[PDB]
Amino acid sequence: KEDTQATREGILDAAEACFHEHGVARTTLEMIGARAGYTRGAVYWHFKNKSEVLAAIVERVHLPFMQELERTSTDQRDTPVHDLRAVMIHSFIELSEDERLRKTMEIMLRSDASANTRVLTEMQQAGFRDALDRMERALRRARDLGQLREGADPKIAARMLHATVLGVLHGAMVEPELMDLKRDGMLALDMTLAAYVKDGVFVPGTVPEPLPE
Amino acid sequence: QATREGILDAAEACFHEHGVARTTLEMIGARAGYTRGAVYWHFKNKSEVLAAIVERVHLPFMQELERTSTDQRDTPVHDLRAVMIHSFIELSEDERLRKTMEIMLRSDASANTRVLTEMQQAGFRDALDRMERALRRARDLGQLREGADPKIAARMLHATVLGVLHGAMVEPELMDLKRDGMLALDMTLAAYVKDGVFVPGTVPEPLPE
Ligand SMILES: Oc1cc(Cl)ccc1Oc1ccc(Cl)cc1Cl
Ligand SMILES: Oc1cc(Cl)ccc1Oc1ccc(Cl)cc1Cl
């Protein structure tokens, strides 16, 4: 087990388990290296430092999800509101059923344990901005198709949706007995969309088909 | 009582800059200007100290929430809405209280440390119960929409408040406590409350008492 034989995915899988178990602060390069079956030099073979490791764990789940959201605004389909619902609701289900995904999402939610460091906060800012941009674009396509209520601002709508969804994610992390990621994510999403979306455009409470492709 | 208050203040300054993990009772003492003996008299450990910090803020907030369901006034939605709007305003205008609140909202680093998640859980449960009591009184008074379930309305209100607070801690310039907090509150209340019950978009008068 020479350090240079470690693969990037094995380094990231090991680091994500370290971070889930010990948190960001207590995780060290030596711990990540040992966990993957090597020593710290196997981590250096891929990443300058622990924050690059964190960024890469985040990117690996945030990238795919941003891709899904981006598809909801396509001019090749004429149901952007339904598509946004398909993406979000299946994401909620996935987060609820896949502990590994859920624990990475919870690493980001938890953020920096003190004002001393802003390392997770900047990644969160950049992620929030990415998600908002994409939701706002889907909502702008919905307006053109006459699917929004008169006067609905798609930028405000996107901001309200992120707020009530973010709140469900934080609540479920704190007290899963009281706040249910699937059930309440879907209620927050539908409630928020119904404030900005015309009646009759989608049926609240329904499970959409996974977005095609 | 007042030495208590001094430790707590200093502990606020440490907890916010340094975090829950790296702060100890000895660091808190020094900034506070007191002896280790003096400090231990009040709090034998960091968690006892955090519990009294959260308490200081969380308690009187729960007392404001609790009042909105009083069987003595007939405007529970208006009152609950007023409490949250005023709270949002106060947080936005008082950096002291806003730092104490972020200490209160930040998560434990791991799934292994908890005692701060334990007060979050208890705090989360207290706030939801009180929201639900005010919305059930609204329901009794004919102020909720047909078929609105006060338990469900309170969960959505709670998620709404929590998403605004968290949104603003990450991106103050993208999530404005006062302006987006009021928009989000009014949106979620209008999903469950009949029209004409409160006046949206405005800051209500101070509640009595
Ligand atoms: O996009 C992300 C950004 C960060 Cl900073 C951390 C995790 C991420 O991944 C997700 C976030 C929210 C939802 Cl609802 C679903 C997924 Cl997969
Ligand atoms: O802001 C968001 C709003 C919505 Cl409705 C969906 C996903 C969002 O994106 C995130 C949610 C949580 C974390 Cl930790 C990171 C990111 Cl990017």
Author numbering:
A (entry chain A): 6 to 218
B (entry chain B): 10 to 218
Q: What's in the article?
A:
The expression of SmeDEF is regulated by SmeT, a transcriptional repressor encoded upstream of smeDEF in the complementary DNA strand. SmeT belongs to the TetR family of transcriptional repressors. The members of this family show a characteristic helix-turn-helix DNA-binding motif at their N-terminal end and a C-terminal region involved in both dimerization and effector binding. The binding of SmeT to its operator region simultaneously represses smeDEF and smeT transcription by the steric interference of RNA polymerase binding to DNA.
The structure of the SmeT-triclosan complex involves one homodimer in the asymmetric unit, as seen for other TetR family members. A closer inspection of the electron density maps in the C-terminal domain showed a clear density in one of the subunits (A). This density was readily interpretable and allows the unambiguous placement of two molecules of the biocide (in agreement with the stoichiometry determined by fluorescence measurements) and the subsequent refinement. One of the triclosan (TCL1) molecules binds to the bottom of the ligand binding site, in close contact with helices α6, α7 and α8. The phenolic hydroxyl group forms a strong hydrogen bond with the Nδ atom of His167 (placed at 2.2 Å), anchoring this molecule almost parallel to helix α8. The hydroxyl group of the phenolic ring of TCL2 forms an H-bond with the Nδ atom of His67 (2.3 Å). The 2,4-dichlorophenoxy ring of TCL2 stacks against the phenol ring of Phe70 (3.4 Å). Residues 10–12, 21–34 and 45–55 that appeared disordered in apo SmeT become well ordered upon triclosan binding. However, no equivalent dense area was seen in subunit B. The volume of the triangle-shaped ligand binding cavity is 1030 Å3, which represents a notable increase with respect to the volume calculated for the apo SmeT structure (630 Å3), but similar to the calculated values for other TetR proteins. Due to the stabilization of the SmeT structure, the distance between the α-3 recognition helices of both subunits could be measured in the SmeT-triclosan complex, with 44.6 Å between the C-alpha atoms of Tyr49 (the N terminal of subunit B in the apo SmeT structure had to be modeled in order to estimate this length). This value is 10 Å longer than the distance between the B-form DNA major grooves, where these helices should bind.
